From a paper:
The thin filament consists of actin, tropomyosin (Tm), and troponin (Tn) in 7:1:1 stoichiometry, and Tn is composed of three subunits: troponin C (TnC), the Ca2+-binding regulatory subunit; troponin I (TnI), the inhibitory subunit; and troponin T (TnT), the Tm-binding subunit. Here we have determined the structure of the entire thin filament from human cardiac muscle in the absence and presence of Ca2+ by fully utilizing the recent technical advances in cryoEM and image analysis.
We also carried out cryoEM structural analysis of the thin filament in the Ca2+ bound state, obtained a 3D reconstruction at 4.8 Å resolution, built an atomic model and compared it with that of the Ca2+ free state. The azimuthal shift around the head-to-tail junction is markedly smaller than the other part near and above the Tn core where the shift distance is close to what has been shown in the previous studies by EM helical image analysis of various types of the thin filaments. This is likely due to TnTN binding to Tm in this region and its N-terminal side also binding to actin filament, restraining the Tm shift.
Author numbering:
A (entry chain Q), B (entry chain P): 11 to 65
């Protein structure tokens, strides 16, 4: 207990460092997902440009 | 005190829970970078199908 505030604070720093790494990945992956979505839509809208040009 | 460890632990435990959540977000986003990349390529493959059908 007595040193657990410290062990848990350091654990929290590490757990936060890891939730942060996971969260930073979430943000980076969020940026990539969005980039892929913009590119997907680039290609989906393009899919329609060709589909429409095709019909 | 037990309360200092409990609070630091709540920070650590919640940070671990947040790591789970952050990891869930980042692993889901990675799965969705795959779904977006896959769907991007779904659309890219289809762009060629329409582009080719178009040409």
């Amino acid at each position: 207990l007595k040193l657990d505030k410290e062990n848990a604070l350091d654990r929290a720093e590490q757990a936060e460092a890891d939730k942060k790494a996971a969260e930073d990945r979430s943000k980076q992956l969020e940026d990539e997902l969005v980039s892929l979505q913009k590119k997907l839509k680039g290609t989906e809208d393009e899919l329609d440009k060709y589909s429409e040009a095709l019909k």
